[PDB]
Design a protein around this ligand. Sequence first.
Ligand SMILES: *[C@@H]1O[C@H](CO)[C@@H](O[C@@H]2O[C@H](CO)[C@@H](O)[C@H](O)[C@H]2NC(C)=O)[C@H](O)[C@H]1NC(C)=O
Ligand SMILES: *[C@@H]1O[C@H](CO)[C@@H](O[C@@H]2O[C@H](CO)[C@@H](O)[C@H](O)[C@H]2NC(C)=O)[C@H](O)[C@H]1NC(C)=O
Ligand SMILES: *[C@@H]1O[C@H](CO)[C@@H](O)[C@H](O)[C@H]1NC(C)=O
Ligand SMILES: *[C@@H]1O[C@H](CO)[C@@H](O)[C@H](O)[C@H]1NC(C)=O
Ligand SMILES: *[C@@H]1O[C@H](CO)[C@@H](O)[C@H](O)[C@H]1NC(C)=O
Ligand SMILES: *[C@@H]1O[C@H](CO)[C@@H](O)[C@H](O)[C@H]1NC(C)=O
Lengths: 49, 207, 188, 302, 40, 49, 49, 50
Amino acid sequence: GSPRHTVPQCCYGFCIDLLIKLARTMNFTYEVHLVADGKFGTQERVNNS
Amino acid sequence: KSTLWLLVGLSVHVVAVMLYLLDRFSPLTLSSAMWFSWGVLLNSFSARILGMVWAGFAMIIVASYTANLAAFLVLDRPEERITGINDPRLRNPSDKFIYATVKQSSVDIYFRRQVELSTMYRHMEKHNYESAAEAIQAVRDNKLHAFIWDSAVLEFEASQKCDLVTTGELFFRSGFGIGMRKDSPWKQNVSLSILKSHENGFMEDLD
Amino acid sequence: IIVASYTANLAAFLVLDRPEERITGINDPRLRNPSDKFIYATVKQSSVDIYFRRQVELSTMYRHMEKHNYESAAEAIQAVRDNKLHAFIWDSAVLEFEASQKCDLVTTGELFFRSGFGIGMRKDSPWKQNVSLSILKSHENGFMEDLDKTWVRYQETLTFENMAGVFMLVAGGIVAGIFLIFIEIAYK
Amino acid sequence: NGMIGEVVYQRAVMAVGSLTINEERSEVVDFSVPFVETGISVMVSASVWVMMFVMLLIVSAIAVFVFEYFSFTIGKAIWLLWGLVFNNSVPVQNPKGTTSKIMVSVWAFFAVIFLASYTANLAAFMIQEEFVDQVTGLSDKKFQRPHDYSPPFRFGTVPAGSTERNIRNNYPYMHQYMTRFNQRGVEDALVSLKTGKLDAFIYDAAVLNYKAGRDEGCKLVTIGSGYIFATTGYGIALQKGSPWKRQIDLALLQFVGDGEMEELETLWLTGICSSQLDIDNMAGVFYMLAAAMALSLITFIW
Amino acid sequence: SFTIGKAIWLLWGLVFNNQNPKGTTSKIMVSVWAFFAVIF
Amino acid sequence: ERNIRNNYPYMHQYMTRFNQRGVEDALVSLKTGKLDAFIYDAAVLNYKA
Amino acid sequence: TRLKIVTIHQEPFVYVKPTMSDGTCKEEFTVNGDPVKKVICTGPNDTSP
Amino acid sequence: NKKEWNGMMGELLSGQADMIVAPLTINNERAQYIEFSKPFKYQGLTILVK
Ligand SMILES: *[C@@H]1O[C@H](CO)[C@@H](O[C@@H]2O[C@H](CO)[C@@H](O)[C@H](O)[C@H]2NC(C)=O)[C@H](O)[C@H]1NC(C)=O
Ligand SMILES: *[C@@H]1O[C@H](CO)[C@@H](O[C@@H]2O[C@H](CO)[C@@H](O)[C@H](O)[C@H]2NC(C)=O)[C@H](O)[C@H]1NC(C)=O
Ligand SMILES: *[C@@H]1O[C@H](CO)[C@@H](O)[C@H](O)[C@H]1NC(C)=O
Ligand SMILES: *[C@@H]1O[C@H](CO)[C@@H](O)[C@H](O)[C@H]1NC(C)=O
Ligand SMILES: *[C@@H]1O[C@H](CO)[C@@H](O)[C@H](O)[C@H]1NC(C)=O
Ligand SMILES: *[C@@H]1O[C@H](CO)[C@@H](O)[C@H](O)[C@H]1NC(C)=O
C-alpha cells in the first residue's frame, strides 16, 4: 500500500487513554509510534543461515 | 446475519355444480344455489347433507393449511447459525464455508500447537489477511463466511454494523495486558496502577 | 382474540413443553450427585459394578449403589415398576426386549461402554478353537439372524386428556339444564 | 496377498490396520478380541366419533323435547348441529326454545376447544418428522430382483473384499448381478451416489457412519443402526501361537475398561444428523366424498 | 336495506366470524375480505 | 468488603446491618426469601446456578 | 463327551419353566411353526434366604 | 484375607462346570483368569426409566 510515506497523525481511543492514565500516574514522558508492518509478530525462520 | 389449493378450487367447482344438479333432481334458482355455495366454501334437504359434508371438509382443509403454514414458519428458522469450532462443516470443511484469521497472529500459533486443528490450519493458510478491516470488508461483500477473532472487538463491530453477528461459543478465555521488556524497573508500579484501575470504576469509566 | 390466545397457550401447554422424566444419559449431573429421590441401581455383583469401581471419579455411584444392589434383574424391573427406583444402569438389548414386554420401560439416549457377550471358557483346552469357529460360522450365515427374528427383532385422533373431563362436564350439565327447564315448568 | 501375505508368510507380526474376520482368516491366523462395534451396512441417498355421534343423538332428542314443550326442527336439527361444529355462518334455523340455544352454546364451546385441540394435535404430528425406509434390510424383496420393482437399481461393494466373499457364500446370483454393478473408488462411489450413477452401496458400518457424519447436507440415508447385518467386529490378527496375544487382549480390554476407547471414539467420530402436503388425508377426503356421492345415489331411487 | 354506511359493524364482525347482503358486488367483496380475514 | 469500603463506606454501613456468616446459609436465605441480592465471586455462583 | 453347562436365569435369554407332569416339556410352537426347543435343566427354586 | 471368586465363575474355577454358556460380560478382570471366545452379541449400557 505505502512503502515509504511516514507522517505524524492523531491516535486516540481506549489504550491511548490507558497510556495517558499511566503517564498521569507514573512520572514519565512517552513517545507514541506505529509499527513498521501490520503484524503482531510470530516466531519464524529467516531465510538465511 | 398452492397447487393443492387449485385442486380444492377444482373440487369445489365440481361440488357446487353437483349440488345444483341434486337440487334439480328432487326439488334465479341456479344463481341462488351458486351463491349458497359461495357462502359455504368460504364460511361467510338431501343437498344440505352434501353441504354440511363439504363444510366440514372445508374447515378441516383450512385448519390443516393454518397448521402447515405455522409449521413452515416456526421450525424453518433456526438452522442457519454456525455451531462454533465444533462444526463438522468446519472440522471437516470444504470450498463453501470460508473462514480465516489474521496473518501472523498468535491465534494461528494456538491452532498450530493443537495437533487436532491441522485441517483448519491448512484451510486458513489460504486466506491469511493483513489487517482486520480487510476481513471486515471481505465478509461485508460476501467474499467470506466466517472469521476467527477475540470477543469485544467483534462485539464493537456488531454494535457498529448490525449485519455482523458473532457466534455463541466463548472458548480460550484469555487476557490482555501490557507487553514488556525483560527485567526492568518499569514492571511493578505499572501492574499496581492497572490493579488500582481495577479496584475502582475506572475500568468501568473506560467502558 | 381471547379464545385464539387460549388455543395458543394450550399449544404452549401440551405440544412443545416436556418435563425431563428421563435422564439423557450418564452425563446428567443430577445422578452424579444423588439424593433421596434420584435412585440409580445395578445388579448385585456384576461387572458393571467393577467397571464403575475402576472409575476413579465415580466413587459416589459405587458407594451409593450398595444401598440398592439387587440379585436378579426382575427385582429391578419390579422395583422401578413400583416407583422404588428411578434409574438402572444395564445392558441395552435386555431392556429393549423388556420394553417390548412392558411398554412403560424406556431406555436412555446415550450409549456407552460398548462391550460384547461371548461364551465363557476354561484355560488351554481342546474345546477352544472349534467353539469360536462355530460361532463365526453362525455369524456368516443367517442363523444369528434367525435367532434375532425369534427373540431379538420380535417386538410387541386420540383426544382423551383434557377433553374427557369436558365430556363428563357436558354430560353432567344436561341434567342441570333440564332441571332449570323444570323450574321454568314450575313458572309456566 | 496384502497383509495376510505379510503375516502368513512371516514377513511381519501383526496388522494394526483394520481387517474383517471370516472362517479362512481364522484358519490362517488368529485374531484378537474385538474393540469396536463394526458390522456391515448399506448406504443410499378411536371412540371419539362414536361418543360424538351419541352426543348428536342427545342433542336431537333434546330438540325433540323442545318441540314437545314449545315445527320443522324435530329431526332436522342434524344439519344445524353438524353445520355448527365448524362455524360456517350458514343460515340453518333460529331455535325459539331456550334449551336448544343453551345446548348449541355448549356444543359450540366444545367445538371451539375441539378444533383448538385438533390444531394442537396437528402441531404434535408436526413434531414427529417421518423417515421413509425403502429397504428394510438384507431380507428385502429388492434383494431378489431389481426388475421386480419398476426401476432396475444397482448396488455393489469394493473389489477384492471379504464382503464379496460373504456374497459369494450367500448369494452367487446377486454376485452375478453385482458383476455388472462393480466399482473401484470409494469416494468415486460416493460421487456416483450423489450424482445418481449408483443407487445403493454395501460396505462396513462405521466407515460409512463416519463418512455420513461429515457428509454435507445430510442427504445420505442409512438403514437402521446395524440390525439385519453381519454383526461382526474389528480385531488384530496374530500368528498361530503368538506370545503376545494374551497381553494384547488384556490391554484392549483395559482400554475398553476405562473409557479410553470411548474417548477415542468421541474424538474420531462425529455422528451428527418437508413441504405443504397431506395427500394421504386428502386421498381420504376424495374417498369419503366418493362414499358420500355413493350414498346420494342410494338415496336417489326412493 | 339500511346497510349503506352501516356495513362497518357486520363487516368487522365477519372478520371474527361472529343482515344478508343482497348485492352481488357486496357478496364478492365480503367474500374476498373474509378470505383475507381467515388468512389474517 | 474491602472493595466496597474503598468504594461505598455508606453502603458498608448499610451492610453492617445486612451481614451474614454462612455462604450456603445465605443461599438458603435466598431460597426462602430472607434476602434480595448477594454480591459474591462470579464463577462460584455460576457453578451454584 | 458330556459337558457341564452352567447358566443363570437371564430374562430374555434363559427361561426356566416348571415341568408338565414329571421331567417333561410341553413342546409349544412359535409364530412360524417352529417348536420351542426346550432342554432339561436342574436348579433351585429360590435363593439362599 | 483373600479376594476370591463367586457365582458361575467361582463354581467354574472349582470345576463344578465345564463351559459357561451365558450372556457373559467381557472385561479386563475376567480375561486375566479365564479365556473368551469371539463374542456373539455387541451392546453398550443404558438407563431404564418409566
Ligand atoms: C515505584 O517503584 C519504586 C521502586 O523503586 C517503589 O518505590 C518504593 O516506594 C515506597 C513508598 O511509596 C517505599 O516504601 C519503598 O521503599 C520504595 N522503594 C524504592 C527503593 O524505591 C514504588 O513501588 C513506586 N514509587 C516510587 C515512585 O518510588
Ligand atoms: C476341532 O474340529 C476339527 C474339525 O473342524 C478337528 O480336526 C479334525 O480331526 C480329525 C481327526 O480324525 C481329522 O480327520 C480332520 O481332518 C481334522 N480337521 C481339520 C480341520 O483338519 C479337531 O479335532 C477339533 N479340535 C480342535 C480344537 O482342533
Ligand atoms: C498514503 O500512502 C501513499 C503511498 O506511500 C502516499 O503517497 C500518500 O501520501 C499517503 N497518504 C497521505 C496520508 O498523504
Ligand atoms: C517527576 O520527577 C521530577 C524529579 O525527578 C520532578 O521534578 C517532577 O515534578 C516529577 N513529576 C511529577 C509531579 O510526577
Ligand atoms: C524469505 O526468502 C526471500 C527470498 O526468496 C526473501 O526475500 C525474504 O526476505 C525471506 N523472508 C524472511 C523471513 O526474511
Ligand atoms: C422352594 O421349595 C421349598 C421347599 O423346601 C419351599 O419351602 C419354598 O417355599 C419354595 N419356594 C418357592 C415357592 O419358590
